[PDB]
């Protein structure tokens, strides 16, 4: 029951022919895979790490300027030459100052001078890449056991390791059997276009090309304490006034100046092992060997009593908490639902099969009521506990919320969203291929449009589609206008 | 000369004493006694919490994180007046001197 | 700043987004509009940094 309370959870029903379910785990989101006869487990992608990641193209932030040296030549003969120019540690530019009999030159005219300064950089900003061999996603798994206290408990699940070397990992669960999850970490997140840049023990995930094209001096990337930099002219701001001479400045520290130039990326931890706490991962949850516990237990007879007053989660689920106040052996808890004194059983148990392992400790159940007045009978007999709950809502509203959830999932994941909670089907693959083609075209067209420009482009294109001809009207208007408006209203996460 | 400082801007900041409080859902915004100090920047926000966080009622709760802000290196903007401006002009006459 | 002086248009100097103060030298100048430096990231709705 680790999933309950995260507010970003979502249910995954149905099983395939050989009892496998494809789910795409996301950080901050934990799927709940129910089944006909399997325990309704909860899986959340716990933490993704990376070890022994290398470096490339370490970059410079602020500099020091020392050994300012100047040299000038007589006008109209040669151009100023200084031996320090050949050295990679000195940066300097040519300018044409004036000279005359005041400066001792024989003939009046413009004469070149050069002012070179030593660029000892300081506070580098390393950009580090991670390759697939060292990736390690970690998956936590929790079962709705109806335990005494695991209602929202984030340290009450078995953990399984995942690496690209061995991705078809096992998972041995206590007294429930095992589940095999044959994930593919190769397609979840790119990580071949992602470069981790570290600045003052802070780091983000940036695109490779965007990091490469930064107007700041870049080094080779080796481990040498004193490297040779390139494009040092970006931080020296040579200036000459009145053409008498020119002076050199350091142009300050760009530590906070690039601190909003890097504004759209996600942050990372980079504390020892660099946990990323972002991205997603798809996995195939073949639930064939996972038989639920206590199938053959009897059913109890004595009455139950609530302990914590029943309350509803965000998704309409009811968390009943009961303690079997009797003396019977471990049993299965009965459950019944009636609407308007008519036994229609318009209720479902999100927990697969609730049992009372120990009499003393209370048991908690996550039931799901219908859209209206409904009395939930728990025990058997005349004195059975009865809970009267009224969930306020309608089926149309729930359908609209599910549509919004699916639209958000497609807008964030992209083509992979078709794999979420989807048994292998002909329609799913046919939609997947079409969406891959369309999404590739869309991202090639719009790769690099801002949150404020997508809305404008969508409005302009729907305006074009309002008044047009030859079905370009309908196509452009509906497709591009609606899609671009949604992606301009959702993009920033 | 004799120009006066008008206002000071801050270009480098340090954050100390990060403090946080959170209330249950369907209760007022979380409160610190430090919200009303002149040197504290403090922003309300939301958070999800249910039985896992010790609160009976499920839903979105409100937590606030006040922080004390002190500047490290200000940048001054100083206006110049008109009763102190002094121009200086050299008048060198062509004498054909050596 | 740091032994560098510039001449800027007065209105532009007021417009730029940095926390300002009264200007008269004193202890603990209470900064105004100081939210421009502090950034409040929310770690996917669980807690705040």
């Amino acid at each position, epitope marked *: 029951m680790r999933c309950v309370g995260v507010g970003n959870r979502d249910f995954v029903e149905g099983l395939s022919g050989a009892t496998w379910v494809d789910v795409v785990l996301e950080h901050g989101g934990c799927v709940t895979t129910m089944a006909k006869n399997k325990p309704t487990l909860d899986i959340e992608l716990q933490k993704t790490e990376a070890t022994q990641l290398a470096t490339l193209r370490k970059l410079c932030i602020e500099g020091k300027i020392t050994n300012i040296t100047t040299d000038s030549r007589c006008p109209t003969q040669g151009e100023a030459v200084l031996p320090e120019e050949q050295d990679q540690n000195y940066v300097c530019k040519h300018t044409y100052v004036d000279r005359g009999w005041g400066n001792g030159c024989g003939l009046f005219g413009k004469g070149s001078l050069v002012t070179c300064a030593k660029f000892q950089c300081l506070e580098p900003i390393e950009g580090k890449v991670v390759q697939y061999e060292n990736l390690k996603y970690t998956v936590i798994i929790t079962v709705h056991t109806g335990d005494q206290h695991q209602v929202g408990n984030e340290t009450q699940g078995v953990t399984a390791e995942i690496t690209p070397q061995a991705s078809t990992t096992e998972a041995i669960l206590p007294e429930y059997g095992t589940l095999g999850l044959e994930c593919s970490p190769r397609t979840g997140l790119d990580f071949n276009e992602m470069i981790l840049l570290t600045m003052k023990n802070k780091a983000w995930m940036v695109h490779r090309q965007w990091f490469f094209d930064l107007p700041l001096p870049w080094a080779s990337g080796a481990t040498t304490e004193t490297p040779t930099w390139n494009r040092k002219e970006l931080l020296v701001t040579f200036k000459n006034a009145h053409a008498k001479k020119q002076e050199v400045v350091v142009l300050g520290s760009q530590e906070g100046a690039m601190h909003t130039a890097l504004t759209g990326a996600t942050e990372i931890q980079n504390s020892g092992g660099t946990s990323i706490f972002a991205g997603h991962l798809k996995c195939r949850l073949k639930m064939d060997k996972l038989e639920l516990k206590g199938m053959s237990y009897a059913m109890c007879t004595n009455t139950f009593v609530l302990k914590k007053e029943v309350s509803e989660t965000q998704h309409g689920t009811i968390l009943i908490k009961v303690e079997y106040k009797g003396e019977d052996a471990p049993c299965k808890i009965p459950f019944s639902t009636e609407d308007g004194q008519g036994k229609a059983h318009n209720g479902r148990l999100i927990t697969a099969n609730p049992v009372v392992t120990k009499k003393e400790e209370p048991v908690n159940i996550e039931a799901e009521p219908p859209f209206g007045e409904s009395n939930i009978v728990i025990g058997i007999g005349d004195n059975a506990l009865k809970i009267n709950w009224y969930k306020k809502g309608s089926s149309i509203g729930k359908m609209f919320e599910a549509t919004a959830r699916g639209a958000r999932r497609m807008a964030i994941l992209g083509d992979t969203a078709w794999d979420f909670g989807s048994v292998g089907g002909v329609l799913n693959s046919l939609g997947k291929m079409v969406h891959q083609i369309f999404g590739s075209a869309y991202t090639a067209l719009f790769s690099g449009v801002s949150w404020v420009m997508k809305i404008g482009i969508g409005v302009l294109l729907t305006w074009i589609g309002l008044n047009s001809k030859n079905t370009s009207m309908s196509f452009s208007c509906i497709a591009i206008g609606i899609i671009t408006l949604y992606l301009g209203a959702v993009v920033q996460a | 000369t004799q120009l006066a400082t008008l206002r000071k801007l801050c270009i480098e900041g340090k954050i100390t004493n990060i403090t*946080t409080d959170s209330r249950c859902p369907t209760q007022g915004e979380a409160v610190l006694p430090e919200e009303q100090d002149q040197n504290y920047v403090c922003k309300h926000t939301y958070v999800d919490r249910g039985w896992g966080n010790g609160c009976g009622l499920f839903g979105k709760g409100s937590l606030v994180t006040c922080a004390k802000f002190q500047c490290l*290196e200000p940048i001054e903007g100083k206006v110049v007046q008109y009763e102190n401006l002094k121009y200086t002009v050299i008048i060198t006459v062509h004498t054909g001197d050596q | 700043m740091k032994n560098k002086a510039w001449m800027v248009h007065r209105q532009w100097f007021f417009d730029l987004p940095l926390p300002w103060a009264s200007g008269a030298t004193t202890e603990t100048p209470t900064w105004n509009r100081k939210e421009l430096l502090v950034t409040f990231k929310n770690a996917h709705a669980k807690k705040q940094e």
Partner: antibody
Amino acid sequence: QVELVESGGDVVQPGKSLRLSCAASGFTFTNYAMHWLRQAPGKGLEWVAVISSDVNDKYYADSVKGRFTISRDNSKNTLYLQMNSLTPEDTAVYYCAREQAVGTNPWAFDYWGQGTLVTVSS
Amino acid sequence: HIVMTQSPLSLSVTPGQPASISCKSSQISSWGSDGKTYLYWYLQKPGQSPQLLIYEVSSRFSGVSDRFSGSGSGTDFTLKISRVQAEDVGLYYCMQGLHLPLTFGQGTRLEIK
């Protein structure tokens, strides 16, 4: 680029007073919370006293309580440590340290002064 | 006052080998309000004023070679030096910063074997 220089270390007989001055440069001195530090030869570093950004939040250590006075003068960019009732145990090289520019602690050490030694004997 | 204990009082390592120092506190150095362990580490080079290496534990001060790395949590912290150079000889001082009477640990040392 920060530069901290010490002054005032000299030989002195027990009981007599002495004032230690820490001149600082390269940063706005008035918006900081300076510290004092010391180390006897062959021993570890020992904390002495702290003056906060606001001049009215001074503190001292137990072994030096009620015997030392720490004071800042913002205008002259110097840190004054007036020490009284000095003893031959208290003699050591004294370090003047700066605050942590990047971090969360209100009290920490980014940069240490050059260090002056005060010699106490009969 | 916090008693600070450093596991080694002298380390002799040949160049190219890792040297690790363990500094165990006497009480918890984790500030509960923010959940950050406030520990510090200083290197005093021979005949020099000490500098700073590791503010907090995970973080690392600027102008510091990438080899130095802080580790540990909850009263038992640890440094690591992947490759030791001739310039790493000195007097590494772990100090707590949580409580106002800042107490350094007894000075450890690192000499080339």
